[PDB]
Amino acid sequence: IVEGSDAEIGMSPWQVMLFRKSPQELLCGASLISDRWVLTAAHCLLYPPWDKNFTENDLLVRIGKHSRTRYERNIEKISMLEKIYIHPRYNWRENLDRDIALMKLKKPVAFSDYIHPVCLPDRETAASLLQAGYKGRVTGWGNLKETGQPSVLQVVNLPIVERPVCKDSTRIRITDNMFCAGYKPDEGKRGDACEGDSGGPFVMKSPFNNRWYQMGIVSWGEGCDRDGKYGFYTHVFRLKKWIQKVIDQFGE
């Protein structure tokens, strides 16, 4: 997270770290949506041009963490993946359309002050909350600048951007399962997601019920915090039906 600030403790309890077994490295973020289900970006788990193709036995998830690196005894829980589900129409050739994936934990994580699931939005929550100018929140242990690692979970509040403006900021094709967020170059503020932030959640707090809703997934961007560039987010509500399917079918 570029131009972020250090998270408070238990500020983002759905935040998940996606961890590579051998070698040990941070891959990207993710989010807890239930005691068994974790939602990340698909391009974290699979990206052929880089011969990237993980499986249930290559990865680990770390939940309830704050320090990036330190093992947080009696706080963090680690879990093993039972099944991975990448979205069927995830296009990794052209623009990371439908960059979304689901992971089922072998065992159901227990909830603490440190571990707690996030809400997925329904139609009107998505329609009420997700509007240009409205700010959401992004979290991760990703890098501090476009190439630098953070000590602990980083957090930043980014305004949603008008679809026109997203489209005329790039040559890349902006499908309807994306939205973009970030500052304009003279909005005075700045900040973006960065490498190893992907899969991490973009959440907003409902002003009606004090609940947090994961509105987007950190997906892609042309660099990090580049002036006149924005960050792109998998539109979680658009993909709600697939999520619904994968959960109702696989994993009873």
Binding site: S5, I9, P13, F111, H116, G133, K205
Partner: peptide, 28 residues
């Protein structure tokens, strides 16, 4: 049911450092 509500904030009637920035944004 449980979800969306933070044990160390919402459930303890408490506000994090930058929540306000988000609410203010709904007004503008």
């Amino acid at each position: 049911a449980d979800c969306g509500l933070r044990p160390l904030f919402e459930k303890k009637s408490l506000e994090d450092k930058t929540e306000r920035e988000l609410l203010e944004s709904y007004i503008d």
